[PDB]
Structures are given as structure tokens and as C-alpha cells.
Write an enzyme that holds these catalytic residues in place. Structure first.
Site, PDB file in Angstrom:
ATOM      1  N   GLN A  21     -11.880   1.939  12.133  1.00  0.00           N
ATOM      2  CA  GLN A  21     -12.795   1.487  11.098  1.00  0.00           C
ATOM      3  C   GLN A  21     -12.759  -0.025  10.891  1.00  0.00           C
ATOM      4  O   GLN A  21     -13.701  -0.585  10.350  1.00  0.00           O
ATOM      5  CB  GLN A  21     -12.489   2.184   9.763  1.00  0.00           C
ATOM      6  CG  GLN A  21     -12.380   3.700   9.843  1.00  0.00           C
ATOM      7  CD  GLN A  21     -12.090   4.315   8.502  1.00  0.00           C
ATOM      8  OE1 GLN A  21     -10.950   4.661   8.205  1.00  0.00           O
ATOM      9  NE2 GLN A  21     -13.123   4.451   7.668  1.00  0.00           N
ATOM     10  N   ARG A  79      -0.873  -0.489   4.543  1.00  0.00           N
ATOM     11  CA  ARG A  79      -0.973   0.679   5.384  1.00  0.00           C
ATOM     12  C   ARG A  79      -2.075   0.469   6.393  1.00  0.00           C
ATOM     13  O   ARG A  79      -3.242   0.261   6.030  1.00  0.00           O
ATOM     14  CB  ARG A  79      -1.285   1.921   4.562  1.00  0.00           C
ATOM     15  CG  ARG A  79      -1.617   3.156   5.413  1.00  0.00           C
ATOM     16  CD  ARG A  79      -1.656   4.410   4.561  1.00  0.00           C
ATOM     17  NE  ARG A  79      -2.029   5.550   5.381  1.00  0.00           N
ATOM     18  CZ  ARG A  79      -3.176   6.218   5.280  1.00  0.00           C
ATOM     19  NH1 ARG A  79      -4.077   5.890   4.349  1.00  0.00           N
ATOM     20  NH2 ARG A  79      -3.409   7.230   6.105  1.00  0.00           N
ATOM     21  N   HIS A 125      -4.984   8.173  13.215  1.00  0.00           N
ATOM     22  CA  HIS A 125      -6.055   8.150  12.251  1.00  0.00           C
ATOM     23  C   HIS A 125      -7.385   8.436  12.949  1.00  0.00           C
ATOM     24  O   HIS A 125      -8.334   7.668  12.876  1.00  0.00           O
ATOM     25  CB  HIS A 125      -6.043   6.832  11.509  1.00  0.00           C
ATOM     26  CG  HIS A 125      -6.717   6.888  10.180  1.00  0.00           C
ATOM     27  ND1 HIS A 125      -6.117   6.431   9.026  1.00  0.00           N
ATOM     28  CD2 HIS A 125      -7.949   7.319   9.821  1.00  0.00           C
ATOM     29  CE1 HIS A 125      -6.956   6.568   8.014  1.00  0.00           C
ATOM     30  NE2 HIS A 125      -8.072   7.107   8.471  1.00  0.00           N
ATOM     31  N   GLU A 171      -4.874  12.607   6.918  1.00  0.00           N
ATOM     32  CA  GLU A 171      -5.798  13.678   6.543  1.00  0.00           C
ATOM     33  C   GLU A 171      -6.141  14.644   7.686  1.00  0.00           C
ATOM     34  O   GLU A 171      -7.285  14.689   8.121  1.00  0.00           O
ATOM     35  CB  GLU A 171      -7.106  13.102   5.988  1.00  0.00           C
ATOM     36  CG  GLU A 171      -6.958  12.124   4.850  1.00  0.00           C
ATOM     37  CD  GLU A 171      -8.288  11.740   4.223  1.00  0.00           C
ATOM     38  OE1 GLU A 171      -8.306  10.894   3.311  1.00  0.00           O
ATOM     39  OE2 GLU A 171      -9.333  12.291   4.623  1.00  0.00           O
ATOM     40  N   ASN A 312      -3.734  11.590  -0.428  1.00  0.00           N
ATOM     41  CA  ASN A 312      -5.031  10.957  -0.627  1.00  0.00           C
ATOM     42  C   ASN A 312      -5.797  11.697  -1.703  1.00  0.00           C
ATOM     43  O   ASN A 312      -5.915  12.922  -1.646  1.00  0.00           O
ATOM     44  CB  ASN A 312      -5.859  10.920   0.664  1.00  0.00           C
ATOM     45  CG  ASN A 312      -5.284   9.970   1.716  1.00  0.00           C
ATOM     46  OD1 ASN A 312      -4.171   9.425   1.568  1.00  0.00           O
ATOM     47  ND2 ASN A 312      -6.047   9.764   2.794  1.00  0.00           N
ATOM     48  N   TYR A 314      -9.478  11.370  -4.152  1.00  0.00           N
ATOM     49  CA  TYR A 314     -10.739  10.715  -4.395  1.00  0.00           C
ATOM     50  C   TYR A 314     -11.524  11.325  -5.535  1.00  0.00           C
ATOM     51  O   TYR A 314     -12.104  10.604  -6.334  1.00  0.00           O
ATOM     52  CB  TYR A 314     -11.580  10.773  -3.133  1.00  0.00           C
ATOM     53  CG  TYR A 314     -11.076   9.831  -2.088  1.00  0.00           C
ATOM     54  CD1 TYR A 314     -11.451   8.490  -2.122  1.00  0.00           C
ATOM     55  CD2 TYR A 314     -10.207  10.268  -1.070  1.00  0.00           C
ATOM     56  CE1 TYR A 314     -10.997   7.600  -1.184  1.00  0.00           C
ATOM     57  CE2 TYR A 314      -9.734   9.377  -0.119  1.00  0.00           C
ATOM     58  CZ  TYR A 314     -10.145   8.040  -0.188  1.00  0.00           C
ATOM     59  OH  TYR A 314      -9.715   7.118   0.720  1.00  0.00           O
ATOM     60  N   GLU A 385      -4.066   6.840  -0.170  1.00  0.00           N
ATOM     61  CA  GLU A 385      -5.464   6.425  -0.323  1.00  0.00           C
ATOM     62  C   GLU A 385      -5.995   6.824  -1.672  1.00  0.00           C
ATOM     63  O   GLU A 385      -5.749   7.932  -2.148  1.00  0.00           O
ATOM     64  CB  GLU A 385      -6.379   7.045   0.734  1.00  0.00           C
ATOM     65  CG  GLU A 385      -6.492   6.298   2.029  1.00  0.00           C
ATOM     66  CD  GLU A 385      -7.328   7.048   3.077  1.00  0.00           C
ATOM     67  OE1 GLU A 385      -8.422   7.552   2.728  1.00  0.00           O
ATOM     68  OE2 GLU A 385      -6.894   7.134   4.250  1.00  0.00           O
ATOM     69  N   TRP A 434      -7.611   2.414  -1.097  1.00  0.00           N
ATOM     70  CA  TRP A 434      -8.613   2.395  -0.036  1.00  0.00           C
ATOM     71  C   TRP A 434      -9.872   1.647  -0.495  1.00  0.00           C
ATOM     72  O   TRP A 434     -10.581   2.120  -1.387  1.00  0.00           O
ATOM     73  CB  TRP A 434      -8.999   3.807   0.428  1.00  0.00           C
ATOM     74  CG  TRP A 434      -9.980   3.732   1.589  1.00  0.00           C
ATOM     75  CD1 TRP A 434     -11.352   3.796   1.532  1.00  0.00           C
ATOM     76  CD2 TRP A 434      -9.647   3.517   2.960  1.00  0.00           C
ATOM     77  NE1 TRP A 434     -11.886   3.634   2.788  1.00  0.00           N
ATOM     78  CE2 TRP A 434     -10.866   3.466   3.685  1.00  0.00           C
ATOM     79  CE3 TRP A 434      -8.437   3.359   3.652  1.00  0.00           C
ATOM     80  CZ2 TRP A 434     -10.901   3.271   5.068  1.00  0.00           C
ATOM     81  CZ3 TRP A 434      -8.473   3.161   5.018  1.00  0.00           C
ATOM     82  CH2 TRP A 434      -9.701   3.112   5.715  1.00  0.00           C
ATOM     83  N   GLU A 441     -17.409   3.426   7.885  1.00  0.00           N
ATOM     84  CA  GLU A 441     -17.125   4.624   7.117  1.00  0.00           C
ATOM     85  C   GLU A 441     -17.606   5.888   7.852  1.00  0.00           C
ATOM     86  O   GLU A 441     -18.401   6.680   7.331  1.00  0.00           O
ATOM     87  CB  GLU A 441     -17.695   4.466   5.700  1.00  0.00           C
ATOM     88  CG  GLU A 441     -17.583   5.684   4.759  1.00  0.00           C
ATOM     89  CD  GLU A 441     -16.190   6.284   4.676  1.00  0.00           C
ATOM     90  OE1 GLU A 441     -16.097   7.513   4.455  1.00  0.00           O
ATOM     91  OE2 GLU A 441     -15.192   5.538   4.824  1.00  0.00           O
ATOM     92  N   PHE A 450     -16.396   0.455   0.721  1.00  0.00           N
ATOM     93  CA  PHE A 450     -15.207   0.904  -0.014  1.00  0.00           C
ATOM     94  C   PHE A 450     -14.256  -0.245  -0.335  1.00  0.00           C
ATOM     95  O   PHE A 450     -13.254  -0.065  -1.039  1.00  0.00           O
ATOM     96  CB  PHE A 450     -14.427   1.936   0.816  1.00  0.00           C
ATOM     97  CG  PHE A 450     -14.846   3.357   0.589  1.00  0.00           C
ATOM     98  CD1 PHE A 450     -14.280   4.099  -0.448  1.00  0.00           C
ATOM     99  CD2 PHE A 450     -15.774   3.965   1.436  1.00  0.00           C
ATOM    100  CE1 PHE A 450     -14.647   5.409  -0.665  1.00  0.00           C
ATOM    101  CE2 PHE A 450     -16.153   5.286   1.238  1.00  0.00           C
ATOM    102  CZ  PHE A 450     -15.589   6.012   0.178  1.00  0.00           C
TER     103      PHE A 450
END
Ligand code: ZN
Length: 478
Positions: A21, A79, A125, A171, A312, A314, A385, A434, A441, A450
Site C-alpha cells: 500500500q 509498524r 500483509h 488480519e 485491529n 474499526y 490498527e 492506521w 486502499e 486513511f
């Protein structure tokens, strides 16, 4: 108000990023293709703005600027993830070690330490090697385990003298559900009737096979680290898991049980094996022979295989009981027999951010952390995150785009919510926002931002601190 002073002494604050990313230089410095290079270039329709990570945020060149930005906020830690194909261009050891790739991550590591920022490294990742995808369908084959183990080992040898914090997988839920059930993410596999309309796959088996292999690769890697590296390097090794908070759709008991099944299927899928040595009962019950089985050796290996768990968070969903469907239409997405919405009677559970799936619900952060305390023995936890996005909008003048009060509000409430959970028993040792910069994304491409810092994709990837960066700078004093 709230500041770092409110939090326990020694508590770690940082930002998070990931290789694909952020980096760009997708084909520079001997990097081999990942399944995300393939996916973005061969299926541009599956990306909101038909874009890719070729250049991304150009951190491959601009990482010195990135480090400077995070030091100016006063971050303790960073991270980031290592690109597997940047170290091993075709995934395996026999394929060859890429020295220019090692040099890059040493440069970044040394740059970070020279400014007093602790590196926390994620091994995987999502940027899985295309060469291993072509060779044996990547995480669908048990051969992934030894290749992953060899890759982790090169990382411990090359970097473990300085890196003391390791995360194996980021994740796995998202990777397995989106990569193998919906097919909306690389490697873009699904049953033909599922959302992704993929040419190959099986939404009822493959998500389970892939994630079973991720768990085994993780445990195997943990064992390797603890056996050969931990004595002389004294680092910690863990894994990052994502969970939503699930509010029962109504006060009925069946809706409460639905919420419990939702969290079992998203979170317990990985937590139960790590704490108890087996998958959640509800998963074993409802999924039967489509869920692979640990041998007793393997059960012993996975149980207790971590020093911490990265979490994580959100958003939250309503969880509503679903009747079975079933028999021919089996998919991981419906296997929990729970229906997840963000809206109840026209009222969203919280205000919706740029990402359709993201509802602002700071209360759920507290709830999730206490649930982990009570149901899993209160393991050492880092928040790996947490964040929110606004739309990328070409019409906004620069000065307007930097005014991200929605982001400030998000962090303020979420940091308060985290504090209250720590003031109760929560075993939380750090927090990572994050993310440091706007970035690629995934299936949303560059349509959403983000970052705590703005990245001008039309002007050489220049970085500009948003208002929230100035806010963090104040929050992080002394
Ligand atoms: Zn550049």
C-alpha cells in the site's frame, strides 16, 4: 482532556503502514510480483478507480520523509510490513535471496532507530508471491508453510539484531474471506455465484483451507523464533487479528447468540485455536467437514503460540439471526448463520465514513477489549490498527483537504474509549494509528484517504500534515 499522560507509563504510540500500500517501486530493486501486482493489473475492474500499487505512496524512495514526519509527531513506534517478494522474488529460498531488498529494509530500520522510533514488523500483509500462486496455489497448499518459515527466518537473521517486535500475519480474516470467499481481493477466488464472479474457487472450503494454513505457518514460525532466535535476540512475536464489535439486532436471545456466532467466526476463528488449541465449537458444529482439523501435535503447537496479540478495530455491526439456506450455496460469508448490517430501521449504528463498511462506534472498542479480557484470559494486546477515512476529492483545494476534524473526532473518542478499557482490566500495551500516510486502499484504490498525512498523488507524492497530525503532536507531548 486526554493525552499520553493519561495512559500507563511506558505505553507505546505509533502509526501503521504496509508494504504494497505504501512502497511503490513494484518492479525496482529486484522485487518479484505479488498476487496483488497480478490482481490489480489483470483485473482493474475490481479496483474502484482501476489503479494499482506500482508507485503507491512512493515510500520505497520517500521513507526518510516518512520517518521525519513520525518523529515530528513524537511517535514511539512504527509498524510496517516486509514485502515477501522483495526478499525472495519468487517466494522460496531456492529461488534466491534479493540483496537489494535486504538493503532497503536495513536502510529503513536504521533510519527509524537513528531517530528513536521502534520498528514493529509484519511478515505477511497480503502481498503473497505470484510464483508460489502459479506453483501450488499459494496458501491453498501446505507447501506454503515451509516457504513462509524460510522467509521469516531470513528476516530474523538479517534484521532480528535490531527488530524486537514481530507480527507474522496481518488480519488473516480479511485475507481469507476477501481472497477466497468473496473474491473481491487478491488472489480473487470465489464460487462462481459469489460477489467476485471469479473464474476459479470454492467459497465454502477455500477460505478455511487458506486460514488453516496461515495458522500453521504462524505457529511453526513462532516455534522457530522461540527455538533459535529469541534467546540471543530477545524480541516478542505475535499475530494481528481484526474484529468488529457485534451488537445484537434486538434484545431476543437468538440475536444475542447471532452476535456471539459473528465474533466466533471472525475473531474466534483464530483466537480459540491460539488460546484453547481448537476452532470455536460453533464453527465446528455449523461447518463440519469443510473446516479442516488439527492433529494433536498441531493443536499443541498452535495453543499458546504467541507473546502478544495485535488487535485491529474499526467499526461495529448489528448481528441478526439467519435461517439456514443451504446445502448447495455454502459460503464462509453465510456459514455463521448471522446477518450483519450497519443500519437498523434506517438508523446507522454510527456515522458512516468514506468506506461503506466503516461506521464510527467508539463504544465497541471498549466492548471488544473487555470481551477479550473475559473470554480469552486477558492476553498481552497491542492495538495494531485503528483509524478512519475521508473521500479523495480532486475538487477540494489543498487547504480544505487538510481540515480533517472528522479524523480528530474519531481518534479523540477512540482513545478515550481505549483508556476506559485500560482503567478496567484490559492488558493493552500499545496503540498504532492506521495510518501514517494516505495509501493504496486495496479494492478502493486511491478513492479514500486513511492517512494522518496527506499524499498528493498528482504532485510527486508530496506529504502534507493534516490537522490530525498537529493534534497527535500535542497528544504525544513528553
Ligand atoms: Zn520516487
Amino acid at each position: 482532556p486526554v493525552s499520553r499522560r493519561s495512559f500507563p507509563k511506558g505505553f507505546i504510540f505509533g502509526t501503521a503502514s504496509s508494504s504494497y500500500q505504501y512502497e511503490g517501486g513494484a518492479a525496482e530493486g529486484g522485487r518479484g510480483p505479488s498476487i496483488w501486482d497480478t490482481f490489480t493489473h489483470q483485473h482493474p475492474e475490481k479496483i474502484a478507480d482501476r489503479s494499482n500499487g506500482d508507485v503507491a505512496s512512493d515510500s520505497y524512495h520517500l521513507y526518510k520523509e516518512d520517518v521525519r514526519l513520525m518523529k515530528d509527531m513524537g511517535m514511539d513506534a512504527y509498524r510496517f510490513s516486509i514485502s515477501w517478494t522483495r526478499i525472495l522474488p519468487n517466494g522460496s529460498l531456492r529461488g534466491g535471496v534479493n540483496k537489494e531488498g535486504i538493503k532497503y529494509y536495513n536502510n529503513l530500520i536504521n533510519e527509524l532507530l537513528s531517530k528513536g522510533v521502534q520498528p514493529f514488523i509484519t511478515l505477511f500483509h497480503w502481498d503473497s508471491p505470484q510464483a508460489l500462486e502459479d506453483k501450488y496455489n499459494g496458501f491453498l497448499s501446505p507447501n506454503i508453510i515451509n516457504d513462509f518459515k524460510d522467509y521469516a527466518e531470513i528476516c530474523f537473521k538479517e534484521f532480528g539484531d535490531r527488530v524486537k517486535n514481530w507480527i507474522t500475519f496481518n488480519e488473516p480474516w480479511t485475507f481469507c474471506s476477501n481472497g477466497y470467499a468473496t473474491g473481491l481481493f487478491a488472489p480473487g477466488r470465489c464460487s462462481p455465484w459469489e460477489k467476485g464472479n471469479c473464474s476459479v474457487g470454492d467459497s465454502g472450503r477455500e477460505p478455511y483451507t487458506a486460514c488453516h494454513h496461515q495458522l500453521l505457518a504462524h505457529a511453526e514460525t513462532v516455534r522457530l523464533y522461540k527455538a533459535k532466535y529469541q534467546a540471543l535476540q530477545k524480541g516478542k512475536i505475535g499475530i494481528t487479528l481484526v474484529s468488529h464489535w457485534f451488537v445484537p439486532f434486538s434484545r431476543s436471545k437468538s440475536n444475542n447468540d447471532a452476535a456471539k456466532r459473528a465474533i466466533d467466526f471472525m475473531f474466534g476463528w483464530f483466537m480459540d485455536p491460539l488460546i484453547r488449541g481448537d476452532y470455536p465449537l460453533s464453527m465446528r458444529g455449523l461447518v463440519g467437514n469443510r473446516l479442516p482439523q488439527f492433529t494433536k501435535e498441531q493443536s499443541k503447537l498452535v495453543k499458546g503460540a504467541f507473546d502478544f496479540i495485535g488487535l485491529n478495530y474499526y467499526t461495529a455491526n448489528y448481528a441478526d439471526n439467519l435461517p439456514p439456506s443451504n446445502g448447495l450455496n455454502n459460503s464462509y460469508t453465510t456459514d455463521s448463520r448471522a446477518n450483519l448490517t450497519g443500519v437498523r430501521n434506517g438508523i446507522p449504528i454510527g456515522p458512516q465514513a468514506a468506506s461503506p463498511w466503516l461506521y464510527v462506534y467508539p463504544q465497541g472498542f471498549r466492548d471488544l477489549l473487555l470481551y477479550v479480557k473475559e473470554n480469552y484470559g486477558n492476553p498481552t494486546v497491542y492495538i495494531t490498527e485503528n483509524g478512519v477515512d475521508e473521500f479523495n476529492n480532486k475538487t477540494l483545494p489543498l487547504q480544505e483537504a487538510l481540515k480533517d476534524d472528522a479524523r480528530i473526532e474519531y481518534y479523540h473518542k477512540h482513545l478515550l474509549s481505549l483508556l476506559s478499557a485500560i482503567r478496567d482490566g484490559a492488558n493493552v500495551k500499545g496503540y498504532f494509528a492506521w495510518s501514517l500516510l494516505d495509501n493504496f486502499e486495496w479494492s478502493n484504490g486511491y478513492t479514500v484517504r486513511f492517512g494522518i498525512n496527506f499524499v498528493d498523488y498528482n504532485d510527486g507524492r508530496k506529504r502534507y500534515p493534516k490537522n490530525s497530525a498537529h493534534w497527535f503532536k500535542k497528544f504525544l507531548l513528553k
